[PDB]
């Protein structure tokens, strides 16, 4: 049961920085209002 | 996307296919786009794609009754002439 607790630990630990790099990709990439991007935004929005 | 891909689903019907004269299935498509304009207004934010869509389907309140009778067999190539000249548009000058 303990090693499963430590697995849950490392899981939460890595998921945190995953969400970090997630929110950090957001501001520079995609639906943020930066360029024209004529009607292409759907592809990147769907990958998001 | 939806408004645009419907606008593209109709761009190719020929004069025998597209009935635009007095029972106009495509002016009925234009009334469908009139209710598409009834759903157009949204004040969340102004987007480039949003104003592109708006430029595609706006001021159709004058298109709605303009061409319903402008497409009858009433309109003979002489009436196409009259249109091109009095409207001073080279559109029907180049294609009556």
């Amino acid at each position: 049961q303990a090693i499963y607790l430590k697995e849950l630990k490392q899981s939460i630990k890595d998921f945190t920085n995953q969400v970090s790099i997630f929110r950090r990709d957001y501001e520079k990439n995609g639906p943020m209002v930066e360029g024209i991007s004529p009607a292409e935004a759907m592809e990147r929005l769907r990958r998001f | 996307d939806s408004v645009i891909k419907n606008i593209q689903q109709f761009k190719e019907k020929s004069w025998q296919d597209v009935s635009k004269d007095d029972l106009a299935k495509m002016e009925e498509d234009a009334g469908k786009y009139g209710e598409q304009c009834s759903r157009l207004p949204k004040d969340l934010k102004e987007w480039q794609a949003y104003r592109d869509l708006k430029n595609y389907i706006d001021s159709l309140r004058e298109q709605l009754p303009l061409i319903i009778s402008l497409k009858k067999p009433s309109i003979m190539p002489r009436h196409w002439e009259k249109i091109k000249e009095i409207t001073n548009t080279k559109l029907n000058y180049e294609n009556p």
Side-chain angles (χ1 to χ4, degrees), chain B residues 30-42 44-45 47-67 69-78:
Chain B
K32 181 264 166 181
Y33 293 158
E35 45 184 352
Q36 294 291 282
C37 186
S38 312
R39 92 183 52 197
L40 191 162
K42 194 52 67 179
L44 58 90
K45 197 198 139 168
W47 285 86
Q48 181 50 262
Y50 154 69
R51 51 184 159 271
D52 292 326
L53 199 59
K54 178 259 189 173
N55 286 282
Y56 260 89
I57 29 126
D58 224 73
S59 79
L60 324 143
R61 252 22 82 219
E62 302 147 356
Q63 185 271 340
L64 189 150
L66 175 81
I67 313 171
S69 161
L70 192 69
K71 289 262 168 151
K72 321 160 52 204
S74 87
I75 296 290
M76 191 68 203
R78 66 164 191 281

Side-chain angles (χ1 to χ4, degrees), chain A residues 24-31 35 38:
Chain A
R24 294 296 55 69
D25 177 280
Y26 273 116
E27 285 327 282
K28 168 273 179 193
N29 188 288

